[PDB]
Amino acid sequence: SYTREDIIRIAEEENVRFIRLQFTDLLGTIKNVEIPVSQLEKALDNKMMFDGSSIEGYVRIEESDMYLYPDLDTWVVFPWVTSDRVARLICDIYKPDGSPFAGDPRGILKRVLKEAEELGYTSMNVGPEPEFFLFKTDEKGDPTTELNDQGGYFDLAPMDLGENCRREIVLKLEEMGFEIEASHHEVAPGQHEIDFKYADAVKAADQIQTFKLVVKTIARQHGLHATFMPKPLFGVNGSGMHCNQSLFKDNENVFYDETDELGLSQTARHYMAGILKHARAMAAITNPTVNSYKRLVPGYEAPCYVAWSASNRSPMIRIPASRGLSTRVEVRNPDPAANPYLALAVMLRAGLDGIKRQMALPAPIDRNIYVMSEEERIEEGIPSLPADLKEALSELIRSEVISDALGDHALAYFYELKEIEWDMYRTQVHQWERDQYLTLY
Amino acid sequence: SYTREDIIRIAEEENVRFIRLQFTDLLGTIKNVEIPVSQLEKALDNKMMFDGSSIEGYVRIEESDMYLYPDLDTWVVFPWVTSDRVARLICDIYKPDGSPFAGDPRGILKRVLKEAEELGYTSMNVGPEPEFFLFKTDEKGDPTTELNDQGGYFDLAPMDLGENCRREIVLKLEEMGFEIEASHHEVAPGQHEIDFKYADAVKAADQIQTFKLVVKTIARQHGLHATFMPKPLFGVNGSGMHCNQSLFKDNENVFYDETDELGLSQTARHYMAGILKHARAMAAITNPTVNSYKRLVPGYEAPCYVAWSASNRSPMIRIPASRGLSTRVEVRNPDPAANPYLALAVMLRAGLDGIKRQMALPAPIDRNIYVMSEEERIEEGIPSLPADLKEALSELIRSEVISDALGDHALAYFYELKEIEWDMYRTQVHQWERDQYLTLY
Amino acid sequence: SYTREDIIRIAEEENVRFIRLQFTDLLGTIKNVEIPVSQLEKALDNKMMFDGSSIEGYVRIEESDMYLYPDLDTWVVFPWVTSDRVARLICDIYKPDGSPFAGDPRGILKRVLKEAEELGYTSMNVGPEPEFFLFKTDEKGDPTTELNDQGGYFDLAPMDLGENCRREIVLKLEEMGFEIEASHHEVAPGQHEIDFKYADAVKAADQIQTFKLVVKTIARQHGLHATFMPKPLFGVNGSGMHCNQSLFKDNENVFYDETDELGLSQTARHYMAGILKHARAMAAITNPTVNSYKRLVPGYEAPCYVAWSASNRSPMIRIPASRGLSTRVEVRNPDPAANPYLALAVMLRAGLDGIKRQMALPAPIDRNIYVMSEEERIEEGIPSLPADLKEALSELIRSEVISDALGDHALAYFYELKEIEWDMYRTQVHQWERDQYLTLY
Amino acid sequence: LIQGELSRFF
Amino acid sequence: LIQGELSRFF
Amino acid sequence: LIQGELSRFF
Amino acid sequence: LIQGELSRFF
Amino acid sequence: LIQGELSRFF
Ligand SMILES: NC(=O)CC[C@H](N)C(=O)O
Ligand SMILES: NC(=O)CC[C@H](N)C(=O)O
Ligand SMILES: NC(=O)CC[C@H](N)C(=O)O
Ligand SMILES: [Mg+2]
Ligand SMILES: [Mg+2]
Ligand SMILES: [Mg+2]
Ligand SMILES: [Mg+2]
Ligand SMILES: [Mg+2]
Ligand SMILES: [Mg+2]
């Protein structure tokens, strides 16, 4: 923990000259206001005013005035091995009248956590698994189509010190204070995964944001480009952001049950049932981009159907073999492009709705895999995820449970942003069309 | 503050070998006379003689002789991390008979501040918001069409240390003694904004000049090109120089009124009314270049109509939500290409005229925005800013209020400069004309 | 003259296989409908239906249906020295109910000629002087910045047969049946002028259209590009379309008067007075493009002021030394980019208004030329032509005389087209702005 | 009205 | 509504 | 079913 | 007043 | 008379 005096003492001792008042918009892009150390005391008094309409993205209509309220527990100093140290503070957005901004994703996640606490659950324990690609750059600094390496699953390809981004990323994260569980080479060439240790939902989302920033910074430092795009290349594996989740009640894992055959309590089963029922509604949030649904194709371990299993090629929900206090429910739809706060909020809200409505868990899918016909698929009651962004947007609009989690203000702006994105995408004429046609016709 | 003995002591202690006797011409370009430290005592005796006709720009017709009178309070040492330190002094221009030069913009601003003080207002509190673009350079050192980054509004795009000009600029300014409020990435790619803390009008204009010089120097140092051109690229956001202003009377903000619904006193409302009435007259000063009116086009947040609001897409005058001693009137027409002294002088003179004549403030524009027709626009009494430099020049010539603020000597030379510029611009045949025509006709 | 039987006989005898049903839109671009010779009889029955909204240009909103009514007297066979001969017919546009289309420029000129005939003037004798530039082409066939030659005024630069376009153009025109008076090299390098023999106004405009088409075709045939753009290059002479005009009443030149000192009748003087009074109103028609007003700059023989003379550097109206039946009033504002039908119509309407109102002719400008100041210029009552397209559009809108000549339907569409063109032009950022700024600011 | 923000798509 | 005709400016 | 892992041959 | 004729020197 | 200063336009 930290206090105002502690922050001032550390900043004076560490010779910090630059402070980043970091926050997040609806699209998940990392936003911040730069600050010289001479304004640190003013920042700590919650007296910095900025636009605030930047949260709305490119659909902002008018300039507003909003205040930044830094969270002292998020203070950290970047270890960029240079003089004039740079520090950061993660801030919440407040209206000039003192009320919190309704469109802040962090505030949305906090409100969902509060309504979870109202049910007796003290915290939501979340451990994400972000994957990213490393691309080579040209003389002008732009990413090329060449990967940084040609390693495979769990390979030792980026060895030694030459352009070893994965080692440096883990080292710098550990120096910052990150709790890193493990990291490994991913399935596709040039793909890497770093797994964090488990923490509370707000801290987990802050860690995801900081991790993306650190990965991009260190990759650019080595003459490489890091991307979290869900499907950068056709025919290769995409990047996922599987989120392991478990509810807690005073350091007691309520998802655990020793008497259960699978070690899953009734509360856990209700949670998974609620997540499964509202899957197509949250697809627009956990898979927010157009490219997100190019990843959700069969044959690349990404989930394409709404079903749960303990062992399958690509289930919607997977139950890891770990038990005891580490029993978890792993949701595999989200990609790293998704907003961490919004994705965690919608998943938690769906689980809470399932718990409250005592939903019945559908039977798990056995070793049988999805070569079955569509008639066999809907005969067994196995739904499918939306095929594109428009279907997910329609499902989100028609959904009343997760739209309430988003809130009235944020839902309208998110819908406007995604509709504009889809409208821009759908009218483009791609090179594939010119390759197929323009000679046949 | 500083004295002659203090300046000599600091120069001897700091090993200063070069002193820049910096001043400004009518076009706003930064001018200076180099001086070895052995001439510092002669400079402090107001005995340095130079041309002085360089103030008139490229329309000077004869060589004159004028003296430089340095302002000791403007002394500063550049922190260019090199031996043989370089210092600067900002000087006023005086005729050989001892009278101040009428064509000095700093003297014009001082005279306007004096006639404001004659009304009982001790100071003009001004905080500008200069925005600029960063362009890449080629092997020969000339700017290209490529931006330094592709960030968005309030993005954290220039991270790390690689070509991080914004961080270095803030750090060097803070080392110089600048009071920087905050900085952020601007809407357009490659666009950056640094906001200063508020100060008196003369100090604010000196800070604007020093800020432009420092930004250009640091950007050049990183193999980049910094420009304050109002509209460098078509189809992207331009660069503005919004100036927050508030009149003070013995550390009392006369613009504040707790009883008012919007927290605006009658004096403040008269000030905004006076600024609105004379808008088209000062447009030639706050938007002095031909390119300045390519920014004043709809759809890029730049103001195009003379109207005020508390919340709108792009009003002429915006009233920030801050109240108390920070209540301000924000004027958004000026671009960074404008002369700071002249722009502040004309804005203050228009506000003073409104205060003296007790002008009636027109009603603010509501959430209704300008899709209305021209008949609806002039039925509601909403004027428009000049479409090009020629209209603004004609309005300035026909105006008696701000022409008196400029003065007889400066007005003629500014008009000659702008007329020559417009005449050169209007006879050019651009590539757009050759693209549209030369094949159709 | 020709008849249906004559046209069929010639087409069968000449082995004509292609017929171009040529017409004109509001912008002056040459439009046509292709027709196989098997449809010639159907075309001659005024039964061909086409869109007709193509006349309105790029501001057409809905598809209509209109009929083409060919003019048998305009029949001609192109001498392109190849088999499968190609012929053309010039057609008037008619609504399906049988009434002529109000937006056809040829119909507008015919209506103006009819209202002239109602005053007792049998014909309008018009001889134009179109000038054009010849540019070299690259390997891809696009025009370059290199001229075809470097000749001067009345030079013999393009001699022999090596790319001798001027000679070929005259020969092919004479073979077609054109009455060519003379041709010569123009002032600027690569500039050429061909003068036709005088004819009636409708025939003169048809000849202008055919001349432009033939010049472009022959120039393209020689690996060159012909343009009628008013000012393709800065610093060199532009291209004008001076139109010599004289009213006739049963082969009697009513402009002639032996008793007059200058050989000008009272009717002629009233005609010139009417043209001079309405000059700024017709400027939007005779100079319809943005580039048209880059030609109207001093020093290049183009007229910039509304005044008449018998000998001057660049008067609006020049009276040639020819007398008797060849006494003419030469109007020098129009450029070849102007619509011939519309320009002739508005000039004739202004002259008729002057004749009807018995306008007083202002005194001619003496050998004194326009180094005089603006005060001297408006003290002598010398108006100036509009500086750009916007001023001309405003003058046209405020004018009631020539707007009636245009008609209600055509005026709105022409105004919309020109407003869109000006709006596109005014927001562009040109290379000149980037050269002047982006380094100074 | 919002053209300068949609420059990402152009 | 009229976008395909204004392609001469783009 | 195994397409993303067989990318070594493509 | 004669600029367009002196273009041979420019 | 002022030609050396107007070189910025040439
Ligand atoms: N083996 C793995 O877990 C890879 C997962 C895969 N990259 C996905 O996007 O889900
Ligand atoms: N979001 C903003 O305030 C940008 C302002 C804009 N650049 C202008 O020129 O006014
Ligand atoms: N007649 C000439 O000498 C040339 C005329 C000039 N080209 C013009 O545009 O008017
Ligand atoms: Mg993985
Ligand atoms: Mg996993
Ligand atoms: Mg700004
Ligand atoms: Mg502002
Ligand atoms: Mg000629
Ligand atoms: Mg002539």
DSSP per-residue string spanning A117-156: HTTT--EEEEEEEEEEEEEEE-TTS-EEEEES----TT--
Report CB contact under 8 Å: C187, G5.
yes
Element (H, E) at C94: strand C85-94
Contacts of C252 (CB under 8 A, 6+ apart): none
Beta strands B85-94 and B16-24 are parallel
- The encoded tokens of residue A362 equal 């559908």
Across C305-427, where does the E strand assignment appear?
A: 308-309, 317-318, 329-331
CB-ligand 2 contact for B131 (6 Å cutoff):
yes
CA pair distance B215, B176, nearest whole angstrom? 13
Residues with CB under 6 A from ligand 1: A 131, 186-187, 237-240, 301-302, 332
Helices (H), A177-278: 201-221, 266-277
The answer to whether A61 contacts D8, with C-beta atoms less than 8 Å apart, is no
Helices within B90-191 (DSSP H only): 105-117, 165-176
Instruction: Produce one character per residue of C184-193: b if its CB has 16 or more CB atoms within 10 Å, e if not.
Output: ebbbbbbbbb
Dist CA B146 CA B221 (whole Å): 17
Q: Which of C395, C398, C293, C374 is closest to C338 using CA atoms?
A: C293
In 3D space, the residue among C262, C284, C338 whose CA is nearest the CA of residue B441 turns out to be C338
**A294 within 8 A of A237, measured Cβ to Cβ:** no
Between G1, G2, G7, which is nearest C236 by CB?
Answer: G7
CA of A90 to the centre of ligand 5 (A): 28
Q: Which segments within C148-293 are labelled E, that is strand?
A: 180-185, 191-196, 199-200, 224-227, 241-248
CB A313 within 8 A of CB A304: no
The strand ranges marked E within C107-164 are: 123-137, 143-147
Query: Which residues is B180 bridged to in the sheet?
Result: B196
Q: Which of B86, B50, B90 is nearest to B70 (CA)?
A: B90
Instruction: Identify whether A252 is a catalytic site residue.
Output: no
Q: Are A97 and A73 in contact (CB under 8 A)?
A: no
User: What is the radius of gyration, based on Cα positions, of chain C?
Assistant: 22
Contact C268, C309 (CB under 8 A): no
A297 phi-psi bin (left φ>0, alpha ψ -120 to 50, beta other): beta
Going by their DSSP bridges, the two strands C317-318 and C308-309 should be labelled as: parallel
Query: What's the C128 CA to ligand 6 centre distance in angstroms?
Result: 56
Q: Which residues have CB under 8 Å from A126's CB, separation 6+?
A: A198, A199, A200, A201, A204, A205, A243, A244, A245, A344
Minimal Cβ distance to F4: which of A299, A369, A371: A299
Neighbours of A83 (CB within 10 A): 8
User: According to DSSP H, which parts of B15-103 are helical?
Assistant: 40-44
Distance, CA of C9 to CA of C402 (rounded, Å): 43
Which residues, in sequence order, are CB contacts of C372 under 8 Å at separation 6+? C380
CA atoms of C291 and B151, how far apart (whole Å): 38
Residue where the block lists tokens 């702008």? B418
CA distance B338 to B289: 8
Radius of gyration of chain D (CA): 6
Query: Which residue's entry shows tokens 């309504």?
Result: A115
Angle formed at CA B258 by CA B256 and CA B261, multiple of 5 degrees: 100
Backbone torsions φ then ψ of C137, nearest 5 degrees: -115, 160
Chains in contact with H, counting 3 or more C-beta pairs less than 8 Å apart as contact: B, C
Q: Which residues, 6+ apart, have CB-to-CB distance to B114 below 8 Å? A: none
Cβ pair D8, A58 in contact under 8 A: yes
> By C-alpha distance, which of C349, C337, C341, C366 is closest to C402?
C349
User: Obtained via which technique?
Assistant: cryo-EM
Question: Measured on CA atoms in the order A294, A296, A298, A302, is the torsion positive or negative?
Answer: positive
Q: Can you tell me the distance from the alpha carbon of B195 to that of A49, in angstroms, rounded to the nearest whole number? A: 12
Q: Specify the DSSP element, H or E, that contains C66.
A: strand C66-77
Count CA atoms closer than 13 A to A15's CA, side-chain side.
7
Could you say which DSSP state residue C384 is in?
Answer: B
Sign of the torsion formed by the C-alpha atoms of A363, A368, A371 and A373: negative
* CA pair distance C25, C106, nearest whole angstrom: 9
Query: Exposed/middle/buried for B118, CB within 10 Å: 0-12, 13-18, 19+?
Result: exposed
Report chain F residues touching chain A, CB-CB < 8 A.
1-5, 7-8, 10
Burial B264-273 (b: 16+ CB within 10 A, else e): bbebbbbbbb
The preferred substitution site among C243, C286, C300 for testing ligand 3, maximizing ligand atoms within 8 Å of CB, is C300
CB distance D1 to B312 below 8 Å? no
Question: Which chain A residue shows the shortest CA-CA distance from B167?
Answer: A18
- B104: annotated active-site residue: no
The answer to whether the CB of A170 falls within 8 A of the CB of A183 is yes
Catalytic residue among A56, A149, A330, A395: A330
- Ligand lying closest to the C-alpha of residue B236: 2
For A186, the token pair is: 């991913």
CB A133 within 8 A of CB A237: no
Question: How remote is the CA of residue E6 from the centroid of ligand 3, in Å?
Answer: 33
B28 lines ligand 2 (CB under 6 A): no
According to DSSP, residue B278 is labeled T
Q: What are phi and psi of C40, to 5 degrees?
A: -65, -45
Q: b/e map of B300-328 (b: 16 or more CB within 10 Å)?
A: bbbbbbbbbbbbbbbbbbbbbbebeebbb
Q: Find out whether C87 and C70 touch, Cβ atoms under 8 Å.
A: no
Instruction: Give C52-57's long-range contacts (Cβ < 8 A, gap of 24+).
Output: C52/C93, C52/C101, C54/C25, C55/C23, C55/C24, C55/C25, C55/C26, C55/C31, C55/C93, C55/C101, C55/C103, C55/C104, C56/C25, C56/C26, C56/C103, C56/C413, C56/C417, C57/C25, C57/C26, C57/C27, C57/C29, C57/C413, C57/C417, C57/E5
Cβ atoms of C205 and C215 within 8 Å: the answer is no
* H or E segment to which residue A225 belongs: strand A224-227
Pair C132, C230: CB distance under 8 Å: no
Q: Tokens 């702006």 identify what position?
A: A413
Separation CA A83–CA A242 (nearest Å): 37
Other C-beta atoms lying within 10 Å of the C-beta of residue C217: 14
Phi, psi of B134 (to 5 degrees): -115, 120
Q: How far apart are CA B429 and CA A441, in angstroms?
A: 43
- Grouping H, G, I as helix, E, B as strand and the rest as coil, residue C148 is coil
Look up residue A273 and give its two tokens: 């049932």
H or E element in which residue B181 lies: strand B180-185
Residue numbers preceding breaks in chain F (C to N > 2.5 A): none
The span from the CA of C334 to the CA of C332, in Å, is 6
Dihedral sign, Cα of residue B67, residue B73, residue B75, residue B79:
negative
CB contact under 8 A, C60 and E2: yes
- For helices A389-398 and A408-426, give the axis angle rounded to 10 degrees: 160
Chain breaks in chain D (C to N over 2.5 A) after: none
Which chain C residues are Cβ-neighbours of E8 within 8 angstroms? 58
